[PDB]
Amino acid sequence: ASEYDDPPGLREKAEYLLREWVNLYHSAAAGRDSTKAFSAFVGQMHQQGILKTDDLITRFFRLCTEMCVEISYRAQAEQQHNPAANPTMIRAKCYHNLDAFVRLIALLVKHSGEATNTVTKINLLNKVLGIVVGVLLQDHDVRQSEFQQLPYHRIFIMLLLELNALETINFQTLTAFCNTFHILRPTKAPGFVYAWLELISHRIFIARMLAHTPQQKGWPMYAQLLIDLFKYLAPFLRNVELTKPMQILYKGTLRVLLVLLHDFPEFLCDYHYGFCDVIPPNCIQLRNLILSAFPRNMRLPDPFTPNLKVDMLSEINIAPRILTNFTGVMPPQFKKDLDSYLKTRSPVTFLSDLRSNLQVSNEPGNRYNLQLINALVLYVGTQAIAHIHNKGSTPSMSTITHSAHMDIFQNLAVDLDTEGRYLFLNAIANQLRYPNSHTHYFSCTMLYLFAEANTEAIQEQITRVLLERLIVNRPHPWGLLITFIELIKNPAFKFWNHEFVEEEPEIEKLFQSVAQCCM
């Protein structure tokens, strides 16, 4: 009778069984965890023949969900079509039904594990989540603007909490909840985004996913969920198309990342490349949160401290950890051609083509393969650090120059256009982080690029990239301050400032704002 090829009189049957259970769950001495009631309810299920086929079991779960969804929608209607109605009592009505359903799911799952089963127990947990995801997405797509997220938000959390109160079984539970959250990422379920961020960032979920996870197995999965959030936000942030609901979502993103920065800075550190590839270059602060994370229990000199000699730091020779295999963006022929340039320094047709290879004027409104600019820059640098290390020296202001590596960087500065150059310079700045061999390499690169600039435009853009990143509220990456402080010291810059600062005296204010914003 329903939209589905649902057997006759099944909705009626299921909704009668759920109605009963909801009264049973709320009944006195039904068991501490609805135990005495459940053993007896499963009997009632079996008698009503819902237990016969797995197809009917799944169908009962779909119908239960839809019932709970309908109860919510009605509860929501009486709260509006009667503004004399108690909204707290309305909420309680939905919770009454939903909490009851959750316990039926949680119990049907914990008791499905026949002779201490792991596969069956998990497979039903997956089935249930899948059935709920299905009901969500159909609701979402049909109800559109009137889509309510409450049923699904409560179902998902309470079930995660019920199934939290089996350290291996705990992981497959989390892996099941993760795939669900990924399926329900805001680009798929936009009307569920607030509930989704509330799920993704739950006290229990962060805890289990990041702190209490074997060999940090959750770290790559959680990092996917955040990428889904940044992938979603990216077109809106990029376009400066920030509605009140978007400002509210962005501020939630800030609160989540601030928590991550403070509690799991090594997590943000490890997945910084991945996050940087998706956050648009205009989100200065959001990206600074990622780029400011540094391994815990690590002394970081104050960038201002007079006569600070950075070479001294034993840390500047140790490379950072990169858990995003960035080399991948590169088309295999491109990397093959690139590696040939890096060792042979031939042919010159590589540099001329490189600028065109970085262009993606195919795709509308971007004209640049940002992700590829990022990969080339990081790769070229890393290859350069290894090449110098092989030569027996260490990345220094002198050892980094006049290499096939620097020829690529120097060419990109001269041969790219203002937009090109902007993206390119940002790709360098994203490496100016805590004291490490990539921070040191790119710090010198950036400084050398300013000094060896024959164009004023090159100098202004370097200044712009470093300054825009320091003019913003804290955090500011260690390497960024270091790079900037060393630049403002070069006669190249002194001369540049002297010229630009009098053609725009408002510019003077910005540099003065950095002395106090950071110090």
């Binding site: 006195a28 435009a457 509220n473």
Partner: protein, 191 residues
């Protein structure tokens, strides 16, 4: 001479000048004072175990956290109807100060503030403390503008009624507590 384009200094100075006219709460070129996001970023303890929601301004209170308490303490499914109804006039002074401090940003804080106000407790707007007259301790100096005598003030940091004999303005002292009849209020939608 300068980069006439959006990717130069002029491009940046344009964004900074734009914040003045942009009524948003998000200014991508300038940032947010992250201390003001209601997170204890200085705290030596982890934030996540008390992390409420991405939209909340204050962490999880212990009434918010659920604990797998001994079976025996789950007394309501048994005492529900015989259990006394909540009447703040029924309760003592200590329970009222608990209800006040703990239920911050809730109707309960105002409901406790009202019952305290009914018991001659008066809240100081400036010093952020509750003050009442001591037993028979009338003010030494007395005018229509202020009063100077010995007063009990509730110090929540040591959880006790404290004797402190100093001058108190009648103006900086909170009037009868209000109650917001704000329908379907959500502090998450405004953030």
């Amino acid at each position: 001479e300068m980069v006439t384009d959006q990717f130069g200094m002029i491009g940046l100075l344009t964004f900074i000048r734009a914040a003045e006219t942009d009524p948003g709460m998000v200014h991508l070129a300038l940032g947010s004072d992250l201390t003001t996001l209601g997170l204890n970023l200085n705290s030596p303890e982890n934030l996540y175990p008390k992390f409420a929601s991405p939209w909340a301004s204050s962490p999880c209170r212990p009434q918010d956290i659920d604990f797998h308490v001994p079976s025996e303490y789950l007394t309501n499914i048994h005492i529900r109807d015989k259990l006394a109804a909540i009447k703040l006039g029924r309760y003592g002074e200590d329970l009222l100060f608990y209800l006040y401090y703990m239920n911050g940003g809730d109707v309960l804080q105002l409901l406790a503030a009202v019952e305290l106000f009914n018991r001659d407790w008066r809240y100081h707007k400036e010093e952020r403390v509750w003050i009442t007259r001591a037993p028979g301790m009338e003010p030494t100096m007395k005018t229509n503008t202020y009063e100077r005598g010995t007063y009990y003030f509730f110090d929540c940091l040591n959880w006790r009624k404290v004797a402190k004999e100093f001058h108190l303005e009648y103006d900086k002292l909170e009037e009868r507590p209000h109650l917001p009849s704000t329908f379907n209020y959500n502090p998450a939608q405004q953030a």
